[PDB]
Design a protein around this nucleic acid. Sequence first.
RNA 1: UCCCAUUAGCUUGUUGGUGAGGUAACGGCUCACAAGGCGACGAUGGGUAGGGGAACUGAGAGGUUUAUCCCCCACACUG
RNA 2: GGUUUAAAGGGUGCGUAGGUUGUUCGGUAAGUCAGCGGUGAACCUGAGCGCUCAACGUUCAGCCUGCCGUUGAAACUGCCGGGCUUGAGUUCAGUGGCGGCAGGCGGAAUUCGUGGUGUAGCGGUGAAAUGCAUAGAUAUCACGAGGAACUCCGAUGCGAAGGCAGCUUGCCAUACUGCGACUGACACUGAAGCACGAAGGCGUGGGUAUCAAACAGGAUUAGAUACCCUGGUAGUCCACGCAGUAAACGAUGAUUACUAGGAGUUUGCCAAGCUUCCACAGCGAAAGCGUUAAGUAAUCCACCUGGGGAG
RNA 3: CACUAGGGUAAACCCGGUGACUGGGGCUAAGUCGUAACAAGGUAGCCGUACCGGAAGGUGCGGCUGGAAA
Lengths: 27, 89, 131, 167
Amino acid sequence: PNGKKRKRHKMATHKRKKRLKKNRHKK
Amino acid sequence: MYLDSAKKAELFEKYGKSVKDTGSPESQIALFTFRIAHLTEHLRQNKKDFATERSLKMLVGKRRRMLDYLIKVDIERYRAIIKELGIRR
Amino acid sequence: MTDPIADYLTRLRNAIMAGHRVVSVPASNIKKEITKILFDKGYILNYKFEENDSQGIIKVALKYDLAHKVNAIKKLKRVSRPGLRKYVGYRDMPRVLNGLGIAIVSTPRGVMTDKEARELKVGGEVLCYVY
Amino acid sequence: IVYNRVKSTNDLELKDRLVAINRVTKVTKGGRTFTFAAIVVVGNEDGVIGWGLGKAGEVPAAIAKGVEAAKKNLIRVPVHNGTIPHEQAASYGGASVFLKPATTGTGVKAGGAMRAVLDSVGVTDVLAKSKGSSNPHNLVKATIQALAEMRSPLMVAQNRGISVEKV
RNA sequence: UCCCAUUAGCUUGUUGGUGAGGUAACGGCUCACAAGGCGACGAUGGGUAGGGGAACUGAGAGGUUUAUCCCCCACACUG
RNA sequence: GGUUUAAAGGGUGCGUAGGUUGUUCGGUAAGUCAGCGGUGAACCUGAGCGCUCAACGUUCAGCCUGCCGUUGAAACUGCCGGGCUUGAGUUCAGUGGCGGCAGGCGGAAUUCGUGGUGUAGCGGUGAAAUGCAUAGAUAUCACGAGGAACUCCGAUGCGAAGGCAGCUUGCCAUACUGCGACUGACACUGAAGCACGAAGGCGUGGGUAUCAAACAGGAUUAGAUACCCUGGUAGUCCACGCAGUAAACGAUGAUUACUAGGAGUUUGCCAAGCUUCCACAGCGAAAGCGUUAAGUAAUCCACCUGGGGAG
RNA sequence: CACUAGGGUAAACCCGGUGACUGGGGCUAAGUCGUAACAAGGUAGCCGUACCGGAAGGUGCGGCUGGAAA
Ligand SMILES: [K+]
Ligand SMILES: [K+]
Ligand SMILES: [Mg+2]
Ligand SMILES: [Mg+2]
Ligand SMILES: [Mg+2]
Ligand SMILES: [Mg+2]
Ligand SMILES: [Mg+2]
Ligand SMILES: [Mg+2]
Ligand SMILES: [Mg+2]
Ligand code: NA
């Protein structure tokens, strides 16, 4: 219950989802 | 499951010695099979009754465990009861 | 129930920790032998066997030191559990509390303590440690 | 549960040993406040042993306060000769200790807080192990409670109601 | 008597029989009916390694390696 | 050695293999125990002897504490046969429920259209503007139409979990209590596997009132791709089919037995079966848990082994 | 005449390498743009999912307290 622990995971999820949304529609 | 005391008594008289023997493995297996068939008939109309499903599955599990007990105790009785009920499928 | 002997030990231990004077257990032959061994070694004050319509009841009266308000028994430990059975020979019999405790052991000559097991040169299943 | 002992005016053989010195800090608006805490174990080379924590602004004052508190808080440990009657495990906080009797010519196989406690209590033949944190407070307390939980064969026979348990 | 299931099916002399041949010797070892055999108690495949006693190490359990020493196996530029 | 909060309980069940198995009688001898016999250089351990000592060399006593064979024992585990009723299940009775599926019915509110009265604004904000309005808004009355959600009761209760709340009926399921009934250990857990599984999302067809991602406009700001305001499309609703995720949480797996007090509370008769808060022993690093344990013990499953890279 | 080491052929598999070009990640300093989180961090925070933005992020729907204030 610090908060930074969840902030790091939130950052990683943001980056991964941005990568996937950029890669969609391109083949 | 159109199940009432009269039907239960008829089943217990048919399977197992005396009509007061409600606890015999044969009587329990017969009762389980009867309500399994009736619940199947209910489900084919109420296809979305997921609570009546898994209640059907728990009944099937109970019947299987009683049959396994009959295997462990007296095999001839198990052959007789499955022949008289047409269970194996 | 998975281990009646461990349950008997747990009942005794919980009664001691709570400070009760009498504890009642369901009866069994091996449990009766263990109670007899405990009385002989002086860990419990008294015991009584009651034969009702069930398997029976063992009623155990515990022993408290009036000088120090301390029970005669300090630790009870089950050794050979159903998930891991333990058997020893008479040469490798355990010694409990450097010889100041007892190890109840079942041997082909009967249920006894590690001392007489070593004396008679017989091994078996180490039921429990008491001290 | 502890045997305890009144101020040992007659048993004045209490030599005092030091376990650890620490310089703790407290923060205020002006700056930082520094103190000193000492763990002191007094012992008469017999079953009598006491422990105390002395806090002051200076090392000698902290050691003196620890000596006083250790003298006030005293117990008795059932030690026969230079060994212990049986094995004993104890826990206190994050510290876990285990003591086992050894042969007569073995000495003390321990170091630090346990060794200081054993010297103060007068046990000279024992194997000691620490399986937890190395904190001085908890190590000292766990060793002392391990010693206090011991029982000599006479006491075992006494509370068992018998005389000779084939010992 | 080592790891991998990000290896689950493998097997057609393959499993058994009759007979014959062959061998120091029994045997699908080889050659002329039946469909069996092995498999989550890990078959098959892939990777890695000569194996033990020693030796070292640790309170013990155990762990590391087989340099010198002894035993067994394999090999002698490649088939 | 651990798993409430440090890494660590599977979303929840059912269930295959496997693991564990109430009490009692009688066999058997697989596990277990005991006796006897065989087998197991050098090095390593006490005692010597020789290297002027020592390393070392050598002799002898003490290790064989594994494997194999053969004789006995029967307490426990296993296997076989029989018995018992406490566990478990079936029956009967009582009581209870937002438990599931399906069909019918209802009122308040909101939106749109038509008509009547009436005219200078309505709406919105911290303040405004966008917006709607003399080609007749807001407001009010009536007629008509359609979709969605169920105020008070209402904080408790039910369900394996996710979840379940207008009324009513039909068909199911199930919990709890007792029985003077029946069977007689028929049990627990459970890798695979199967089923169910909020919201959002996808396909086909209906429906489309409110709200509202994206988007458009107006503001606030140094800018405002936001917070505020006015519009607004998927979606939100229904049927069928996918998908299989969550702070799917009590961040606490399932069984069994035992161990203090207080204060409330639901249900059928003081007492179960629940559902909530302080709090003994005990546990814990502490915060804390404490009979609904994170205490005392037994069985089985899941998971952890410094952080990042990296799910 | 069979048997076969070896040779040629084709395939397909496995193990490696290199390649115009094109993507993450780690570490070091600190150039640039902002201020997302930590206090009710100035719009409580976080989980899942969808759409959208120079970036931290924003918004919708459901959930949680590991949130004040009340
Ligand atoms: K048993
Ligand atoms: K939830
Ligand atoms: Mg983001
Ligand atoms: Mg964690
Ligand atoms: Mg859970
Ligand atoms: Mg989780
Ligand atoms: Mg900010
Ligand atoms: Mg904020
Ligand atoms: Mg937007
Ligand atoms: Na749709």
